[PDB]
Swiss-Prot record, chain B:
The chain holds residues 676 to 736 of 774 of the full protein. It is found in: Virion; Host nucleus. Influenza RNA polymerase is composed of three subunits: PB1, PB2 and PA. Interacts (via N-terminus) with PB1 (via C-terminus). Interacts with nucleoprotein NP (via N-terminus). Interacts with host ANP32A (via C-terminus); this interaction promotes viral RNA synthesis. This is Polymerase basic protein 2. Belongs to the influenza viruses PB2 family. Coiled coil: none annotated. It comes from Influenza C virus (strain C/Johannesburg/1/1966). It comes from the Viruses. Plays an essential role in transcription initiation and cap-stealing mechanism, in which cellular capped pre-mRNAs are used to generate primers for viral transcription. Recognizes and binds a wide range of cap structures of target pre-RNAs which are subsequently cleaved after 10-13 nucleotides by the viral protein PA. Plays a role in the initiation of the viral genome replication and modulates the activity of the ribonucleoprotein (RNP) complex.
Amino acid sequence: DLAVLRDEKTAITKGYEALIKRLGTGDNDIPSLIAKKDYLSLYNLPEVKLMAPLIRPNRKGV
Amino acid sequence: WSKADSSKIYCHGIAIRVPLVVGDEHMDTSLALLEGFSVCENDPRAPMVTRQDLIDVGFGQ
């Protein structure tokens, strides 16, 4: 209610928020994976999968 | 060169002639300015840019 931004920047911000909320404790989270050096399992998180549609599609691979 | 005299091509002021005649073959220059773009109707809202950032643009933009 106390906001003036549009759905786009708000969606980006909420995606970042969720991605940070995954910064907690417990396996399947990014800290444990870093400790195990499982840099690959991060790519398959669900949060990046929800923020992906926001990426520029014509240059998302690069 | 310029329109209304399209049958001429200046080279250091030396006017040269075209062996042909055209009234529309030249009128369509929407693709002779940039490579993968096309001119469109004027819009001040659109932001000014350079030749480098063009690579990171999308469509309908």
